[PDB]
């Protein structure tokens, strides 16, 4: 009832598997295979843009896969922000639930990540302000829906030639250089300020040209971090659930927080000030995305009337205990109820 007219599909075998996509999508080219899916770049003849087309690999083989597929579709359908990956399209060749086995997601093509940009030029302080501004603007939006990215790092940030940025590749599970210490060692539950830690690690590296904490294992990584931000105080130790983790931390030679200005000489002092506020060991005391947008570092870009929040995002589905075919059916409904973006 009032369902979209079914496009004409065509089938091609690209590498391992049969791709069946609307004729709208042309000149498909493999861009590599992940654990959960395979990705091609394509020309979207409807919008005139190159896009990423992800074919999920057997999304309904198990509860874990079926729910993961549902999770991803619910998340991409919710997120509508200039600095965040959006769902351009989702389709199946299936004409019914009985024949529904394959899910294709169409999203912003990764033309260049933040590493490609660093590779080919020296960013100005203005480039760094604008890049970090857009990350924080996207994070204000997702955090306002109680979405946590969980895996912010340069390879998950798309950047175009206008230095416009999008947050890509959200963590869908229920290099560590950019991970908050409290999650790297499982000290406590994910809060959204794990993302703020990641932005701090990214900004430091864009300012200096050097990875901030390029540790080789969890221990080496944690010692590099604690050398800069100081060993946990008694107040933080109370909030760590594991006795073993608490015992391990107490085993460490107490270290003072370093003076950041001496680690970042010649950087804009407002940038260093913001870095201080992002890289606080106690996740409760880190600046939030919204606060960070008001920092004087971003005075040139900050507009409180154009830093929007999201609709609330209902994640109560996470506690549902359902059959493969029930997750599959919910996923199918979300394919059916998909409204493409305007224009």
């Amino acid at each position: 009832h009032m369902s979209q007219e079914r496009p004409t599909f065509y089938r091609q075998e690209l590498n391992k598997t049969i791709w069946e996509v609307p004729e709208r999508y042309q000149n498909l080219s493999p861009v590599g295979s992940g654990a959960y899916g395979s990705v091609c770049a394509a020309f979207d003849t409807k919008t005139g843009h190159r896009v990423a087309v992800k074919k999920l690999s057997r999304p309904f083989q198990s509860i874990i896969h079926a729910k993961r597929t549902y999770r991803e579709l619910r998340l991409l359908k919710h997120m509508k922000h200039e600095n965040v990956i959006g769902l351009l399209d989702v389709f199946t060749p299936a004409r019914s639930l009985e024949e529904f086995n394959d899910v294709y997601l169409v999203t912003h093509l990764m033309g260049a990540d933040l590493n490609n940009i660093v590779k080919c030029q020296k960013l100005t302080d203005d480039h760094v302000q604008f890049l970090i501004y857009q990350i924080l603007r996207g994070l204000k939006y997702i955090h306002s829906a109680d979405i946590i990215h969980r895996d912010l790092k340069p390879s998950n940030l798309a950047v175009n030639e206008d230095c416009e940025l999008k947050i890509l590749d959200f963590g869908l599970a229920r290099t560590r250089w950019y991970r908050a210490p409290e999650i790297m060692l499982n000290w406590m539950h994910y809060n959204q300020t794990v993302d703020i830690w990641s932005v701090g690690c990214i900004m430091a590296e864009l300012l200096t040209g050097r990875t901030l904490f390029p540790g080789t294992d969890h221990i080496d990584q944690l010692k590099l971090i604690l050398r800069l931000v100081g060993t946990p105080g008694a107040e933080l130790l109370k909030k760590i659930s594991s006795e073993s983790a608490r015992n391990y931390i107490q085993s460490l030679a107490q270290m003072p927080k370093m003076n950041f200005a001496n680690v970042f000489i010649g950087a804009n002092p407002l940038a260093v000030d913001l870095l201080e506020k992002m890289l606080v060991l106690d996740s409760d005391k880190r600046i939030t995305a919204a606060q960070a947008l008001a920092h004087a570092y971003f005075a040139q870009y900050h507009d409180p009337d154009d830093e929007p929040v999201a609709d609330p995002y209902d994640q109560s589905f996470e506690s549902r205990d359902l059959l493969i075919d029930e997750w599959k059916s919910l996923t199918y409904d979300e394919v059916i109820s998909f409204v493409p973006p305007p224009l």
Partner: peptide, 16 residues
């Protein structure tokens, strides 16, 4: 309104 706010709008190079 973000491109108007930028100090410079010379295109970045994406691959090299």
């Amino acid at each position: 309104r973000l491109q108007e706010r930028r100090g410079s709008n010379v295109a970045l190079m994406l691959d090299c």
